[PDB]
Amino acid sequence: AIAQLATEYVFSDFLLKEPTEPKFKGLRLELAVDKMVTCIAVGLPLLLISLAFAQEISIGTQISCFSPSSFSARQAAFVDSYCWAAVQQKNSLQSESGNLPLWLHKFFPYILLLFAILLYLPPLFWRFAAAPHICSDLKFIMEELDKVYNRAIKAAKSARDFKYPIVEQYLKTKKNSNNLIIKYISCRLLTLIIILLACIYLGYYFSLSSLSDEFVCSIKSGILRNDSTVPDQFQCKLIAVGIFQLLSVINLVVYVLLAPVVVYTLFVPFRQKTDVLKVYEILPTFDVLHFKSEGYNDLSLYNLFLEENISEVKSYKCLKVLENIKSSGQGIDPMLLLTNLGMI
Template identity: 55%
Template sequence: MAIASVATEYVFSDFLLKDAKEPKYKGVRLELALDKIVTILAVGLPLFLISLAFAQEVSVGTQITCFTPFNFSMKQAVYVDSFCWAAVQYQADNSPLWLHKFFPYILLLIAILMSVPAALWRFTGVPYLSSDLNFIMEELDRFYNHAIKLAKNLATLDDRDAEQDSQSALDLAEGCFKYPLVEQYLKTKGFSCGLVVKYMVCQCLTLLVLLLSCVYLCYYIFLASLVDEFPCDVRTGMLKNDSAIPAAVQCKMVAVGVFRLLSYINLGVYLLLTPLVVLAALGPARQSSSFLQAYEMLPGFGALSKFKPIYNDLSIYLLFLKENLSELKSFKCLQVLELLQQSAEEGFDTMCVLQTLSQVKTDVFDSQKMGSITNICEMDKPKN
């Protein structure tokens, strides 16, 4: 009997969650993996393409080449190139040549616009989500610890007072677990929509910028990039009446071919990102509390299993809670307990699993250990 008591004490002291010396949940993710992928690609790709565009400019040396007469000196030819480059946006035929000149800067504008939804979410939604999510995760771990302490108290009762003390412990447990704080707090989030509105606004902005960027890139590829030559009139100012200078000089934009290739790359990636944004926007409607099923084996927890997917704050909290399950130590332990329950025979005692759980490591489950635990629990059952 003494050995059993010592073993039980050791089991529960080892299975109980310890208070961490470092701050809890410092690795909480406040941005969904899907949203992070969209943000990194949508912002990082244009910046990468800008670097390629400027690298092309450095390697080529000039963005425009004009066919000057043979009697022009080198300085005159350089002046004509500079003059025509500055006069690109003032062509009389209203051709979209200015898009070639400002192509890298338009990509930079796209990158800035794509970062706005992520920044908006960080400054409007994250502060509220961070504090609430830390509270919910802490309460889930605390709720689990209360259940383990109850099981420990029931397991260490003396035989003579077992019936009376067990009844009093169960009465106390009913008072403690009848209204779990974390469950009641989550249920209140089902009646508010402030956080989900902010999340959906960010998703809509992301989708809108993506679609507008795709429209611009399509226009550039199929219309603007087809025109890269134009006549340039250099007879202005003091040279207006100079007959030695031709009326027009033929010029060509050198980097248009490279810009068109970069546009194809950017357009292809943005078209692939569009379904991901739509999928992320549908996330709150598809989210359920089924991943919290492991907590239903604890006394008093289980009302959230009736949660129906809907656009409210509860769906957002469940989304981010599922994203941070790796930070919940109680969830890992309950998964072990759930696995033991599923693999046990009918009539398997859950309390007995808690008493013998330390015999099995959380990362190793072999049939021999499972069988030994089942036999121990069956032997400890009271006989009718």
């Protein structure tokens, strides 16, 4: 049913499942824009395939050949099945557009599934090769930030009654290596390349004459060759090709809307904005240094992932509360922090 496919592929959490494992607990490991690009680019061809053969849009078989009236029902079934299998054998069928449109019309679901798989591959490579590396580091950074917050408020609480910037040094180190960022821009670049190839294929397929689904087929190989009761050629038509073209144009539109999103995603430093650690600079136990910007290096990627997963950090939440209050400038940062009383 149409509504079942709708639920399964947009309303269900299709490709939105969090990693079912206690290693990454609440950690996203895939940027929201990347998760939605993957969800679209993968589920749309699948949702389109499932639509193209919805039981109410499909009239029946995928091909019909119009055997003569003298032919029996089984003889007609042979002609249909033969021509269906004969869209490959170029000698049997004669089509005005060519044999390539026939191949594309028969194997359109396979090609869409191929595009879905190829578009799922880069997110899978990211989830397996580079997601744990960033997950461990991000979990460690969040733990260290919570610890420095607790120590800062404990020092402030003792005042109301070591000191090494380890996380800052770790991020300074991340500023050097660029392995994770080249992995990220490589998976994004393969996603963009596959999306553009899919756009090219879908634009070509939609550009077909729309009469290329009608091909002349001749069951005259083998012992049927010199047979006389069988006519020389049959007029076959590939049903559901109009549906294929109408769905291919939808896929092409969505993909050419998605390609600018991927291209923008490709520029990872430009997206690093609203410096997340700047809110921590108001802590005594934390050095006054953001030092996170301007590079095609893993530091920018970590900045993005921190900007995403930082809302889970309670210390960040309270510090951002104080920072927003500081916009008015009524009281003072350490006083409001001591008032806070939120170690964990």
